[PDB]
Design an enzyme around this catalytic site. Structure first.
Site, PDB file in Angstrom:
ATOM      1  N   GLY A  11      57.128  25.783  36.767  1.00 10.94           N
ATOM      2  CA  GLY A  11      57.310  24.395  36.277  1.00 10.94           C
ATOM      3  C   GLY A  11      57.822  24.410  34.845  1.00 10.94           C
ATOM      4  O   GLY A  11      57.281  25.139  33.968  1.00 10.94           O
ATOM      5  N   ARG A  72      62.105  27.656  42.692  1.00  5.93           N
ATOM      6  CA  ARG A  72      61.162  28.538  43.330  1.00  5.93           C
ATOM      7  C   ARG A  72      61.948  29.504  44.182  1.00  5.93           C
ATOM      8  O   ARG A  72      63.006  29.172  44.717  1.00  5.93           O
ATOM      9  CB  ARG A  72      60.173  27.756  44.189  1.00  5.93           C
ATOM     10  N   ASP A 103      51.940  32.385  35.433  1.00  7.07           N
ATOM     11  CA  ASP A 103      51.336  33.439  36.249  1.00  7.07           C
ATOM     12  C   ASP A 103      52.206  34.013  37.365  1.00  7.07           C
ATOM     13  O   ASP A 103      52.387  35.220  37.438  1.00  7.07           O
ATOM     14  CB  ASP A 103      50.036  32.904  36.886  1.00  7.07           C
ATOM     15  N   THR A 127      54.213  26.751  30.122  1.00  8.31           N
ATOM     16  CA  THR A 127      53.641  25.764  31.049  1.00  8.31           C
ATOM     17  C   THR A 127      52.929  24.736  30.192  1.00  8.31           C
ATOM     18  O   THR A 127      52.418  25.072  29.152  1.00  8.31           O
ATOM     19  CB  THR A 127      52.634  26.404  32.077  1.00  8.31           C
ATOM     20  N   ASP A 129      50.208  23.403  31.360  1.00 11.57           N
ATOM     21  CA  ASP A 129      48.819  23.453  31.865  1.00 11.57           C
ATOM     22  C   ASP A 129      47.839  24.280  31.046  1.00 11.57           C
ATOM     23  O   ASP A 129      46.594  24.150  31.210  1.00 11.57           O
ATOM     24  CB  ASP A 129      48.789  24.009  33.317  1.00 11.57           C
ATOM     25  N   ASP A 131      47.292  27.386  31.290  1.00  7.51           N
ATOM     26  CA  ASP A 131      46.478  28.150  32.261  1.00  7.51           C
ATOM     27  C   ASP A 131      46.920  29.609  32.353  1.00  7.51           C
ATOM     28  O   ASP A 131      46.751  30.252  33.358  1.00  7.51           O
ATOM     29  CB  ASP A 131      46.467  27.477  33.653  1.00  7.51           C
ATOM     30  N   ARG A 173      47.080  21.480  36.808  1.00  6.80           N
ATOM     31  CA  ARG A 173      46.799  22.294  37.984  1.00  6.80           C
ATOM     32  C   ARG A 173      45.260  22.558  37.963  1.00  6.80           C
ATOM     33  O   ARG A 173      44.508  21.603  37.994  1.00  6.80           O
ATOM     34  CB  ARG A 173      47.637  23.586  37.968  1.00  6.80           C
TER      35      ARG A 173
END
Ligand SMILES: Nc1ncnc2c1ncn2[C@@H]1O[C@H](COP(=O)(O)OP(=O)(O)NP(=O)(O)O)[C@@H](O)[C@H]1O
Ligand SMILES: Nc1ncnc2c1ncn2[C@@H]1O[C@H](COP(=O)(O)OP(=O)(O)NP(=O)(O)O)[C@@H](O)[C@H]1O
Ligand SMILES: O=P(O)(O)OC[C@H]1O[C@](O)(CO)[C@@H](O)[C@@H]1O
Ligand SMILES: O=P(O)(O)OC[C@H]1O[C@](O)(CO)[C@@H](O)[C@@H]1O
Ligand SMILES: [Mg+2]
Ligand SMILES: [Mg+2]
Lengths: 317, 317
Positions: A11, A72, A103, A127, A129, A131, A173
């Site tokens: 993303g 993707r 990731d 990202t 996020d 994360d 997420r």
């Protein structure tokens, strides 16, 4: 380290353009040729790989998104598929690859380094996020945080007018950081995150214990990692009937011009990735940790929630 | 620690309201009465001191400025003047004082702690300039950084249209951080700061070495700590005649709603200041250092420029 490639995968996030800019400029400054790979791993496969000059990253540091695009490529999980991508880089004599993403993107980069002796890979955490291991903050997080803040600050205007409770869904997420940092910053009375046991009966009772005391509405900030805002609204209504609306902030969180924090972070990490390639490093993700620029092995990275902060937001509420 | 006071002193900064909010809420949560001192040290003297309830800090976390106000009180340098302020706090049984501001404000707080046995003092770093020891970042800096970015991003639009070089003056007092972080974030071709020897002939030659290569204009970001933009423009014209304008960004840099970074930082430091008072501490300034919340003695504080970052911006330019 005479040729390097750079790509953006997963993303998109504000600051990815800055990161690419720093990679391109730092490479060219060191007399390294640089190729843009377009559409993430898909472009690696489809051979959408093109040399980038100084001017190719003009007018990019302030722009949201990724001018390299991202798409993707689930087939990159297949070692035989990777052989094609690997060949597409070796055709051109590329010796290093900077991957900007998350990731999943990192796992791609690990595989490239494992499976081609002549290519080093360095990951840059991009990202919203937050994360990604190896960094306290990912490129995009600060911008997305602020985006959420600006939106909720506007929702508070309408909530106040009508004494209307809003149940707001944030991105993230499986990470609650966005919800937490933003909930704090807007004085949200409840913050719902996947990292903390979620007590719908308790949130209900807390709101009700607020009406009696004269607070006529609240803001519930819900990380999508925990549940949808509409599910939160559903489950709450079991215990309580307040006048409320659901907002889902959505993809607006992924856009916009990056903040100062993101532009500086991206630039630093973009520059560092090139330096690491020049030093012979591979299979590491860069980051900032306790305010130092560091690099960590993808192993360690694959092998952060601030409970203290969560408690503070609750005490301030 | 049954009564505490809180005040804002020195130049206001976005996030001061959040800090005051966190002090007030954290105090009330711990069954501590809290008094607002208005107009900084001047209000201490004039006895402009009033109890604050939970609602007094409603609708404040997103607002710029300080609802407590700030005004200079140079007479606070006189020990006999301080005796009046000290008495004004002891009258009400106040046992702790949180001071939100800068270096000058801290010296006030040190004197209060030295000169009244029954009052503990804790300083919270509030300034856009980032020029306060004991913290990597001051409350206001992130917001001001972003404000500068948004302004210069708009100046770049007009600079591009007309191939017009702009010489832009940033705030910072004697600190170049604003100029540096912002210059990086906007791709400024020159960053002029007090911490680095300033070579007007070299900046000239660098711009000229840019025209030959086809860059038709640039952005020069000038920290006011080094020189005024108009002086920069004057001295440059000795070596070179480019079509240029001067902008002084001015007090716009001090306003606006604080960013997420400032709201979170302020909230953390505001909460921590109260906790430190509860623990019997005095004569310390709080901060974030290498991403940990810390407290440092005013001594150490009175006894940070990132040359690496400055070099990166120059290589990227
Ligand atoms: N285990 C894996 N091995 C090899 N390649 C992978 C692996 N996981 C992901 N990839 C590649 O990485 C790409 C991006 O992963 P993806 O999960 O889309 O995003 P991500 O980088 O984790 N960031 P986010 O959008 O936050 O999830 C995938 O399309 C694959 O091309
Ligand atoms: N050396 C000192 N001793 C006692 N009080 C002081 C001292 N210096 C400053 N003060 C008090 O602190 C107030 C604020 O100081 P001032 O220099 O205005 O701002 P500051 O807190 O350093 N922040 P800034 O606006 O960034 O300079 C002054 O008006 C005095 O009331
Ligand atoms: O952009 P898509 O494919 O809708 O995916 C949504 C996800 O992407 C992110 O925006 C970024 O990883 C998440 O916060 C969110 O869960
Ligand atoms: O607000 P005044 O009194 O004009 O002072 C200007 C100074 O205040 C600051 O805005 C904040 O300390 C500095 O950046 C600037 O030099
Ligand atoms: Mg993923
Ligand atoms: Mg001062």
């Amino acid at each position: 380290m005479k040729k390097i490639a750079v790509l953006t995968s997963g993303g998109d996030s504000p600051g990815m353009n800055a990161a690419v800019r720093a990679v391109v400029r730092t490479a060219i400054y060191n007399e390294i040729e640089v190729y843009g790979v377009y559409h993430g791993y898909q472009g690696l496969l489809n051979d959408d790989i093109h040399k980038l000059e100084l001017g190719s990253v003009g007018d990019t540091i302030q722009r949201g998104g990724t001018f390299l695009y991202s798409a993707r490529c689930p087939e990159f999980k297949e070692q035989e598929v990777r052989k094609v991508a690997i060949e597409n880089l070796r055709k051109r004599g590329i010796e290093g690859l900077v991957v900007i993403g998350g990731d999943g993107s990192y796992r791609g980069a690990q595989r490239i380094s494992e499976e081609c002796k002549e290519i080093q890979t360095i990951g840059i955490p991009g990202t919203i996020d937050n994360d990604i291991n190896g960094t306290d903050f990912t490129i995009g997080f600060d911008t997305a945080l602020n985006t959420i803040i600006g939106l909720v600050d506007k929702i508070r205007d309408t909530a106040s007018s009508h004494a209307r409770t809003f149940i707001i869904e944030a991105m993230g997420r499986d990470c609650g950081d966005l919800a937490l940092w933003a909930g704090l910053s807007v004085g949200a009375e409840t913050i719902v995150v996947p990292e903390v046991k979620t007590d719908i009966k308790e949130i209900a009772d807390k709101i009700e214990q607020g009406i009696k005391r004269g607070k006529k509405h609240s803001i519930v900030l819900v990380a999508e990692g925990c549940m949808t805002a509409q599910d939160c609204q559903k489950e709450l209504s079991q215990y309580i009937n307040v006048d409320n609306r659901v907002s889902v902030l959505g993809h607006v969180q992924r856009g916009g011009s990056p903040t100062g924090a993101d532009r500086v972070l991206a630039s630093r990490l973009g520059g560092y990735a090139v330096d690491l390639l020049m030093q012979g490093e591979t299979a590491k993700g860069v980051g900032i940790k306790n305010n130092k620029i560091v690099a960590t092995s993808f192993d360690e990275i694959f092998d952060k929630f601030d409970y203290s902060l969560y408690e503070l937001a609750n005490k301030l509420s």
